[PDB]
């Protein structure tokens, strides 16, 4: 029902090498460069319009 978040020589050397050589920083930079090479979701307003619904609440009108 419940879980414990944040309750956790080779390992010490790996941690020191990560400290000196910045392994996880390189991982985060790699994910940033991954998001650089994708297709951006910018729609060309005003020549393109965002999706809507037939229930959209806009301007008042008298039928």
């Amino acid at each position: 029902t419940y879980k414990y978040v944040n309750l956790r020589m080779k390992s010490v050397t790996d941690r020191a090498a990560q400290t000196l050589l910045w392994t996880e920083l390189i991982r985060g930079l790699g994910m940033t460069l991954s998001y650089l090479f994708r297709e951006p979701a910018t729609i060309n307003y005003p020549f393109e319009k965002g999706p809507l619904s037939p229930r959209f609440r806009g301007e008042h009108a008298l039928r």
């Binding site: 050397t13 020191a16 090498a17 990560q18 050589l21 392994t23 390189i26 991982r27």
Partner: protein, 70 residues
């Protein structure tokens, strides 16, 4: 009747747990790569600095030969 209903077989499994890859070399590997690069750079700098000292000695002895006329 028609209404918004999930299909007969239901919807598929959805992942909801954390998935970190865990990637890169072991720390011994990058330490060895850095040490080898250090040694290669040291050797190349050693050779080129010795050659530069030889060239400087040659230029200085040319200057010493040229001195008396000046």
């Amino acid at each position: 009747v028609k209404q918004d209903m999930p299909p007969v077989g239901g919807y598929g499994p959805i992942d909801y747990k954390r998935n970190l890859p865990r990637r890169g070399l072991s720390g011994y590997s990058m330490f060895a790569v850095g040490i080898g690069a250090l040694l290669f750079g040291y050797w190349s700098m050693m050779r080129w600095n010795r050659e530069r000292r030889r060239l400087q000695i040659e230029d200085f002895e040319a200057r010493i030969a040229l001195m008396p006329l000046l």
